[PDB]
């Protein structure tokens, strides 16, 4: 189908997608769901130049239409940058909707349920979006909530590694992926729909245009606003967007060689978390039924790389490689989420089900009862990880 596979080439960008025995705790991290654009920077820049191309008689007509458009999308983002959007918490009421329902025996009664979020508003509106929707099913309820920059090394790890700030703003990848664009991204049969003269303009900044232009239309959908823009591209123009995008978040934020699996070992912390609180759990120190975690793309991105998720920790050496290979809109599209269930079974063994954005997910180790894998197989596995991304990290200071 055309339409889901047009979505998924909004990338991080897209929606979350269609999602229509009992386990005795669930262990959970989610992004915020969608949202609006968090920089002006493309909008200004699409702007700036059809503007500019207004004055010297350089619009066609679909280019008149759209600076007109782009115009009021300014007046509409105007405060509105970063914020949780009404499909934002659809998303939210959504994920917890099914979990409840699903699971009604887990957070029946008095059950303890526990959320943190960072300090970021989105993030925070989407626990408040989850939290509300499962006190109206079960107002008896136990809950803690929290959030603020006290969860900054579990939540926001990307931002206190100074290797990794260093290589996420300068590192290796950026030529890489300013390669790549250049070779998939063909600008002018784009701009010939807006433009005259779309041959008079440089491959720099035809190129930035074009690419302003598929991020403001990619995010389009996340708003809320019934507005759309998806068609002023064809599947193949966004097939090619999407796979420049899809190889920025692969190399920034996940296992590719030219990270050296830094980007994926900070994540270590939170893995650590979600073991510790399990165990809490499974001991009986902690008698929560749920821990529910509200955070970024950035959060989830590596920690499903960093848990070896089958196919998120690749490492592909051949950039143009990638997109086969690697799909950030199976990882982290809007509203991304991960859940461990767990479970015991009649002779009190503990099993573990994990679940990628409402999808049993994989690991690279045996069980004789897909999708379920033992605990403490699983935890050793785990523990392994963790001690690696120590090691790497050890490599960088």
């Given at each position: 189908?055309?339409?889901?596979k047009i979505q998924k080439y909004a990338g991080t960008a897209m929606p979350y997608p269609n999602r229509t025995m009992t386990p005795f705790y669930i262990n959970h991290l989610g992004r915020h769901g969608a949202r609006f654009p968090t920089s002006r920077?493309?909008?200004?820049?699409?702007?700036?130049?059809?503007?500019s191309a207004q004055q010297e008689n350089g619009l066609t007509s679909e280019g008149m239409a759209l600076l007109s458009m782009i115009r009021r999308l300014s007046r509409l983002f105007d405060g509105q940058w970063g914020k949780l959007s009404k499909l934002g918490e659809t998303e939210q009421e959504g994920i917890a909707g099914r979990m409840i329902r699903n699971y009604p025996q887990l957070f029946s009664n008095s059950a303890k349920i526990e959320a943190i979020?960072?300090?970021?508003?989105?993030s925070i509106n989407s626990m408040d979006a989850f939290l509300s929707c499962?006190?109206?099913?079960?107002?008896?309820?136990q809950v803690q909530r929290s959030e603020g920059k006290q969860y900054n090394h579990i939540l926001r790890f990307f931002d206190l590694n100074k290797s990794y700030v260093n290589y996420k703003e300068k590192g290796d990848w950026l030529p890489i992926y300013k390669a790549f664009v250049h070779k998939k991204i063909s600008p002018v049969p784009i701009m010939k729909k807006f433009l005259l003269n779309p041959e008079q303009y440089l491959d720099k900044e035809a190129?930035?245009?074009?690419?302003?232009?598929?991020?403001?239309?990619?995010?389009?959908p996340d708003t809320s606003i019934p507005l759309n823009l998806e068609d002023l591209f064809?599947?193949?123009?966004?097939?090619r967007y999407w796979q420049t995008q899809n190889l920025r978040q692969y190399m920034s934020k996940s296992s590719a060689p030219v990270g050296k699996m830094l980007p994926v070992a900070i994540a270590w912390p939170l893995l650590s978390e979600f073991i510790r609180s399990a165990q809490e759990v499974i001991s009986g120190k902690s008698d929560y039924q749920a821990n529910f975690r509200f955070a970024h793309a950035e959060t989830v991105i590596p920690f499903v790389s960093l848990m070896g998720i089958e196919k998120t920790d690749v490492q592909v050496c051949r950039p143009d490689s990638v997109s086969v290979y690697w799909k950030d809109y199976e990882i982290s599209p809007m509203a991304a989420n991960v859940q461990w269930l767990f479970y015991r079974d009649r002779d009190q063994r503990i099993w573990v089900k994990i679940l990628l954005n409402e999808e049993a997910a994989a690991l690279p180790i045996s069980t004789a009862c897909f999708p379920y894998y033992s605990w403490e197989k699983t935890r050793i596995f785990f523990n392994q990880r963790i001690e690696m991304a120590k090691k790497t990290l050890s490599v960088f200071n």
């Open positions: 189908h055309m339409q889901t920077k493309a909008l200004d820049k699409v702007e700036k130049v059809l503007v979020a960072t300090y970021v508003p989105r499962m006190i109206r099913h079960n107002p008896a309820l190129e930035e245009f074009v690419m302003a232009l598929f991020s403001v239309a990619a995010i389009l064809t599947l193949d123009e966004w097939h």
